[PDB]
Every structure is written in C-alpha cells, then in structure tokens.
C-alpha cells in the first residue's frame, strides 16, 4: 500500500549569510546565482573600528 | 463524443425554434445544459496552503 503524502523540497544545509559586525557595506564581492565555494569573500564592511 | 456539445447546440439552435412553433405546448428537453466546470485538485489546493 503506498500513500501520496503532501511535501515541499528543503535544501540539505541552508546558510544564512548574517553580519556579525556593524558597519557601512562597502563592497558586495560575489554576483547573484552563482555558485560559492567555502570561503569565497561575499561583502566587505567597512574595518574602521 | 461529448455529448455536452450536442445539448449546447440543440438548445441554443433547435430547441427554441421547436417551442416556438404553433400548437406546441411544452418543449421538455431531457437531458443538461452548459455550465463551465471547476474540476479542483484538492491535493494542489493542500500544496498551496
């Protein structure tokens, strides 16, 4: 006996790219839809304090 | 064949012709009538909150 069950599709691991720090966003480094390796730099806020 | 088609002309074209003839009392058309259908998928409408 097999069941239809309603699902929706979740990636296995979700990053949720959040600012630590505050500051003026300098630079956005990565384009949109691409894909991203470990480390690759995203933004650059400004280091002045 | 869909027979919704046939009942759509016979009452749009035939029917009222016949109950407008003389003598004719009553026009007893014996089967249904056009009506757009909305067939929902209750599944889709579970997907879609």
């Known amino acids: ?49 | 064949a869909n027979t919704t088609a046939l009942a759509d002309y016979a009452v749009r074209n035939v029917n009222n012709e016949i109950r407008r003839l003389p003598g004719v009392g009553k026009l007893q058309f014996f089967d249904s009538e056009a009506a757009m259908r909305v067939w929902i998928d209750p599944q889709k409408l579970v997907g879609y909150g």
């Open chain 1, 1 to 49: 006996v097999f069941a239809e069950l309603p699902g929706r599709i979740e990636p296995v691991r979700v990053a949720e790219v959040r600012a630590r720090v505050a500051g003026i966003v300098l630079k956005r480094t990565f384009e949109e839809g691409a894909d991203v390796k470990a480390g690759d730099v995203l933004f650059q806020i400004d280091p002045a304090p």
